[PDB]
Amino acid sequence: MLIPKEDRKKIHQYLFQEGVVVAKKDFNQPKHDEIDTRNLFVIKALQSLTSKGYVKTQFSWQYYYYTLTDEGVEFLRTELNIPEGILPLTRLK
Amino acid sequence: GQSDKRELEGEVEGTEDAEAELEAEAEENDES
Amino acid sequence: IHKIRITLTSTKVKQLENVSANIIRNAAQYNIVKKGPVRMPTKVLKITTRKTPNGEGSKTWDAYEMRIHKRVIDLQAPASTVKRITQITIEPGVDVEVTI
Amino acid sequence: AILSKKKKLVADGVFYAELNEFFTRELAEQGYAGVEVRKTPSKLEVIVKASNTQGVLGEQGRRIHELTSLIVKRFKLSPEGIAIYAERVEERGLSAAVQAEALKAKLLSGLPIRRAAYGVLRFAMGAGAKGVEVVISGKLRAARAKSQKYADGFMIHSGQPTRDFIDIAIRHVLMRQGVLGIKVKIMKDPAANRFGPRALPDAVKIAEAKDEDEVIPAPTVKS
Amino acid sequence: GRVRTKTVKRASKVLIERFYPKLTLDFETNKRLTSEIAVIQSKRLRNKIAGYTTHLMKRIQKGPVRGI
RNA sequence: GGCACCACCAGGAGUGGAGCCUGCGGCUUAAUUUGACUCAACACGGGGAAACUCACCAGGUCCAGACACAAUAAGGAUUGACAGAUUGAGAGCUCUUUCUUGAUUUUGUGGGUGGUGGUGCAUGGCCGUUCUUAGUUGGUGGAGUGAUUUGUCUGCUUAAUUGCGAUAACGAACGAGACCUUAACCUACUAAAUAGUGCUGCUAGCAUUUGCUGGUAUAGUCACUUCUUAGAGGGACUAUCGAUUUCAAGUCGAUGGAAGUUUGAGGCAAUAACAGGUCUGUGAUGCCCUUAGACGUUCUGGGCCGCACGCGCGCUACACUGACGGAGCCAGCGAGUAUAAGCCUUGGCCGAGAGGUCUGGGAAAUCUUGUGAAACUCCGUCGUGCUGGGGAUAGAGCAUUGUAAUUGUUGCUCUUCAACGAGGAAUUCCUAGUAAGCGCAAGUCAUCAGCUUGCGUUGAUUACGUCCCUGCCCUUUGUACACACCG
C-alpha cells in the first residue's frame, strides 16, 4: 500500500518509545488513536515488518497486538536515525 | 494403538516420563 | 462529622459479607453511630439462549444467571476516618464507592 | 463514562474474559495457567499463573515490561494503573490447565498417542489428583474419525460438586491432517480443598466408640 | 415413594452397631446426637440418616433385628 | 415380564372444518439462496429478510496481492485529480484534458491472503437421540482350556440396579438418589429515609363525641421490623397411631404440622456410540475450486413475501356463561443514558385518535411504574337475525420509524361487512394452583410479535390404576448376521 514519507515515520517511532502497538481491526477507521495517521496505515506498515521478522504479531478478538523485537531495534537504529544508547520503555526495568 | 505392541511401551515409556517429571518438579521447589 | 454513604457491590456474597462485617466492627470499637448495612433486593441477571448452535434437534434452552447484591452503609464521621476504613477492608471482589 | 451497576460488573467480566484469552495466546509456550485480577486502590494488580515464570518476565523482565505495556494501550489505562507479577504454580499435575498445554507441546512432536497420553496421566497421579481422564478424538493416519478415552482413578460426573472439584481445559492441537481436540479432566482431592467443601455431599464419616470403660459402684471424688 | 437408599441405610445402622446405648426412641435427641457423632455435609442427609436410625431402634425394641 | 398421559383407562382441553400470520414441499422466477423430512423435518437455523445482514440476481469500483527476487525507474517507477464526455452516481472507473506528489511505489514469479464456495459420508466443538430411561464397571472368591460368566437374581416393593428378600458370592465405584437454584414456614435473631406502619407535630374535609378519612415532616435530629428486602440459622425425618405384607423393604387411612404426591419446580447428569444436525458462529480446520473481469470486498436496483396446490405449529371466531357503553379497579417477571449520535421517559400543554411541543427525574427498591392489565364485578342497550357474534377483501385521509416504507413497516379516523351457525377419517397435551381461559415484560429491534422465553390473575373434571394399543428396557429363545437386517 502507498503511504506518504512523512506519515510512515510517525508509525515508526511509535514502534519505538512505547513501541508495543495495539490496533483495532477496522481498516476504514479514520484514525488509530495516539497515532495521528490512518488506522489502516498503522496495521499494514507493521505488517511488512512482521512479514520480514522484525516485530511479533498477535490476532485475537479482532484486536491486533504488536511488539518491537530486539532484532528489530537494529533495523530502527539506523532507519529512524535515532541517537545511539537509548532503550525505549521495555528494557528500563 | 490397535496393535498387540506399542502399548506395553506406551505405558512404561509414558509412565517413566512422568517419573522423570516428579523427580524434576520436586527438585526446583525444595532447593529454592 | 459528615453525612457520608458507602456502597458495597459484588457478585459473590461471602466476599460481600466479609467487607460488610469488619467495617461495621470498625464502627463498633470506634464510637461512630452507624446505619446499615442495608441488604438491597438482589438482582438476578438472566439471558435465555438456545443450546443448538444450528437449528436442528429438540427445542431446549440455556438460562444463565448472575446474582449481584448491594450493601449501602451510612456514616457520620470525618472524611479521614471513613477513607482509611476502606483501604483496611479492601479485598478484590468488592468495589468500594464512598459518597458524602 | 458513567455505567450502570448491571453493565459495570458485566464489563468487568468481559474485560477479564478478553484479558484471560489474550494471555493464553500470548504466553502459551510457558505453560500459562490463568489470570487473577486483584483490584486494589491506585493499582490494577494482574497475577499471571504459569509453570515457567522465567520465560515470562525474562532477560531482566523484558517480556513482562512489553506485556503490561500491551495492556494499557488497549484498555485506555494510565502507565501507573497496573502492576503485574509472575508466580509459579504449586502443583503442576493437580492443575488441569498447565498439563493441557503441556500435553499440547508433547503432542506436536510426533510422539505416539499411547506414550503421550499416559505420560501426563501418571504425572497427575504423581501429584495426588484423585482422578484424571484424557480424551483424544479426530484423525491420525486414517480418514475415519475415532475417539479414545483414557480414564484412570476415581471420577465424579453429576451434580454441584462437579463444579467445585473438577477443572477442565479443552485445546485443539494443530495437525497437518486436520483438527485433533483434547479434553483433560482432573480433580483435586476433597481433603486438599481449602476454600469450598472438603468432601463429597454423601461422605459420611463415623467417629469411633468411646465405650469399654470400667465403672465402680458408688464412690465420691473430692478434689 | 419414600424408600431409603443404601447410603442412608448402611450409614445409619453402623451408628447403632457402634453407639447403641446413647441413642433413644425419639427423633429430635437422635437428630442432635447424630449431629455430633458423624460428620454430615447436608442437614437433609442427616435428617434422612437419623430418621432410619430411630426406626431401627423401634424394631430392636419389638424383637431381634437382622444384620445389627 | 416391567415402566410410561413423548401409551392406554376415566375425563378435560383441543387440533384436524372458515379466514388469517408463519414454515415445508411444489410451481414460477433474475433470484424466488439454502440447511433439515417418522418420533428426533415443517413460529426450527433464536431465520419477525426495505438498505446492511444475503450466501442470489443485473450492474460498478478497491487491493485492503504482505515478503525475496527478475523487469522499469530520477532525463521521473507511479498515486491522487479541476472542465467536458460517459455512467445510476458529484466512481479521476474510464475516455479528451496536462496538471500534481515523488521511490511509499508499476510488470512477471515464487509466495501468499480471503471466501454464507463444495465436502457434517474428511473433522473438531456444541446440540439432539439411545435416555433422563436406568443402566454400567472393576477388586477378591466360584464356573469354564478359553473367549467369557457369576456378582449384576425366582418373588415383593420403589419414581428408580432402590431396597427387602433369595443366594457361589462378599464387599465396592459411576449413574439414580444424594447435591445446587428457586417456591412455601419463621411476630425467633441481624438491620434497613432507595420499604412500610404507628405515634407525634402541621394541617384539611363530614358528624360535632374526644370520632372517621386524606396530605405533609431526607430534621418530628421519633420508636419498630409484624407485613416489604436479604444473611445467618432453625424447621420434615412418612413424625405418632391403626392396619396390610415374607412383618422386611414399603404401602394405604387418620392426628399434628407451613409443608406427609421424591415437600413443589427445575440445573447437573453414567459406559461406550449414531454416517442424527451444523465447515451458513469463530483469526477452527484438512483436501478440491477461485483469488484481480475476484466465488474477497464495497455501492447501486431487485429477493427471500413471489401462487393452479398438499401439510404443521396457532390466533380470531362461530354467540346470550355473550357483544358493546358506562361504573368498580386488583398482579408479578423484568428494562434504562453523557457529547451521546441517543434510553425509560413522568408531569404539563395541543391533537378524536395515532401523534406533536416544553420541562424534570432516573445510570437506578428512589424516576419511568403502584407499570391503577385483561379476564372479572355491577349497571343498561342489543334479543338469536350470519344480529350490534367475526373483521377477512378493498378505497380515501391523517402520523410516526428510518438515507430510502412503491410489493401498502406500523398505527389511527371513516368506509368496505367475506367465510365462519361447533368441524369427517384421524390424532395431540395433561393429575393441583395443574389443565384451561386472561393479560404484562425480555429477545430479535431505527420500525414491526398472531412467535418463543418468563411472570403473574381466575381456576377446574376425573384417575391415583393397568399392560389392552404404542414405545423402550430386561430375560429366555433362534441365527448361515459382526460393515451386525439399510445384514
Swiss-Prot record, chain B:
What happens to this protein after translation, modification-wise? Phosphorylation by TORC1 upon nutrient replenishment inhibits STM1 and causes its release from dormant ribosomes.
The source's domain of life comes to: Eukaryota
Span of the secretion signal?
none
Q: Report the subcellular localization.
A: Cytoplasm
Q: Where is the composition biased (Acidic residues)?
A: 10-31
Describe the protein's quaternary organization and the partners it interacts with: Associates with mature 80S ribosomes. Binds to the head domain of the 40S ribosomal subunit and prevents mRNA binding by inserting its alpha-helix domain towards the mRNA entry tunnel at the decoding site, where it blocks the binding of tRNA and mRNA at the A- and P-sites. Interacts with eEF2; interaction sequesters eEF2 at the A-site of the ribosome, thereby blocking the interaction sites of the mRNA-tRNA complex, promoting ribosome stabilization and hibernation.
Similarity comment text for this entry: Belongs to the STM1 family.
Q: What does this protein do?
A: Ribosome preservation factor that protect a small pool of nontranslating, vacant ribosomes in cells under nutrient starvation conditions. Under nutrient-limiting conditions, cells reduce ribosome biogenesis and degrade ribosomes via autophagy (ribophagy) or proteasomal degradation. To avoid excessive degradation during starvation, STM1 binds to and protects 80S ribosomes from proteasomal degradation. Under nutrient-sufficient conditions, TORC1 phosphorylates and inhibits STM1 to prevent formation of dormant 80S ribosomes.
Protein name in the entry? Ribosome-associated protein STM1
Organism, scientific name: Candida albicans (strain SC5314 / ATCC MYA-2876)
**Gene that produces this protein:** STM1
Swiss-Prot record, chain C:
GO BP terms: namely: translation
Query: Subcellular localization, per the record?
Result: Cytoplasm
**Primary localization class, coarse:** cytoplasm
A cellular component term from Gene Ontology for this protein is: yeast-form cell wall
Q: What does the UniProt keyword field contain? A: Cytoplasm, Ribonucleoprotein, Ribosomal protein
What Gene Ontology molecular function terms does this protein carry? RNA binding; structural constituent of ribosome
Subunit structure comment from the entry: Component of the small ribosomal subunit. Mature ribosomes consist of a small (40S) and a large (60S) subunit. The 40S subunit contains about 32 different proteins and 1 molecule of RNA (18S). The 60S subunit contains 45 different proteins and 3 molecules of RNA (25S, 5.8S and 5S).
Tell me its family. Belongs to the universal ribosomal protein uS10 family.
Q: What job does this protein perform?
A: Component of the ribosome, a large ribonucleoprotein complex responsible for the synthesis of proteins in the cell. The small ribosomal subunit (SSU) binds messenger RNAs (mRNAs) and translates the encoded message by selecting cognate aminoacyl-transfer RNA (tRNA) molecules. The large subunit (LSU) contains the ribosomal catalytic site termed the peptidyl transferase center (PTC), which catalyzes the formation of peptide bonds, thereby polymerizing the amino acids delivered by tRNAs into a polypeptide chain.
This protein is called what? Small ribosomal subunit protein uS10
What organism does the UniProt record list as the source? Candida albicans (strain SC5314 / ATCC MYA-2876) (Yeast)
UniProtKB/Swiss-Prot annotation, chain D:
Task: Output the Pfam families linked to this UniProt entry.
Answer: KH_2, Ribosomal_S3_C
| GO biological processes | cytoplasmic translation; maintenance of translational fidelity; nonfunctional rRNA decay; ribosomal small subunit export from nucleus
A GO molecular function for this record?
RNA binding
The Gene Ontology CC terms held by the record are: cytosolic small ribosomal subunit; fungal biofilm matrix; hyphal cell wall; nucleus; preribosome, small subunit precursor
Query: Subcellular localization, per the record?
Result: Cytoplasm
- Domain KH type-2: from-to ranges: 19-90
Question: What Gene3D superfamilies does UniProt report for this protein, alphabetically?
Answer: 3.30.300.20, Ribosomal protein S3, C-terminal domain (3.30.1140.32)
Keyword set, alphabetical order: Cytoplasm, Ribonucleoprotein, Ribosomal protein, RNA-binding
Q: How does it assemble?
A: Component of the small ribosomal subunit. Mature ribosomes consist of a small (40S) and a large (60S) subunit. The 40S subunit contains about 32 different proteins and 1 molecule of RNA (18S). The 60S subunit contains 45 different proteins and 3 molecules of RNA (25S, 5.8S and 5S).
UniProt record similarity statement: Belongs to the universal ribosomal protein uS3 family.
Q: What protein name applies here? A: Small ribosomal subunit protein uS3
UniProtKB/Swiss-Prot annotation, chain E:
Q: A single Gene Ontology molecular function, please?
A: structural constituent of ribosome
Please provide the Gene Ontology terms (biological process) for this protein.
translation
Span of the signal peptide: none
Kindly list the GO CC terms recorded for this protein. Answer: cytosol; ribonucleoprotein complex; ribosome
Q: What domain of life is recorded for the organism?
A: Eukaryota
Q: What is its main location?
A: cytoplasm
**Coiled coil stretches, renumbered:** none
Name where it's found: Cytoplasm
Q: Which UniProt keywords apply?
A: Cytoplasm, Ribonucleoprotein, Ribosomal protein
UniProt subunit comment: Component of the small ribosomal subunit. Mature ribosomes consist of a small (40S) and a large (60S) subunit. The 40S subunit contains about 32 different proteins and 1 molecule of RNA (18S). The 60S subunit contains 45 different proteins and 3 molecules of RNA (25S, 5.8S and 5S).
Name the family the entry cites. Answer: Belongs to the eukaryotic ribosomal protein eS17 family.
Please give the function described in this protein's UniProt entry: Component of the ribosome, a large ribonucleoprotein complex responsible for the synthesis of proteins in the cell. The small ribosomal subunit (SSU) binds messenger RNAs (mRNAs) and translates the encoded message by selecting cognate aminoacyl-transfer RNA (tRNA) molecules. The large subunit (LSU) contains the ribosomal catalytic site termed the peptidyl transferase center (PTC), which catalyzes the formation of peptide bonds, thereby polymerizing the amino acids delivered by tRNAs into a polypeptide chain.
Spell out the protein name for this chain. Small ribosomal subunit protein eS17
Q: Which organism is it from?
A: Candida albicans (strain SC5314 / ATCC MYA-2876)
Which residues of the entire protein appear here: the answer is 2 to 69 of 137
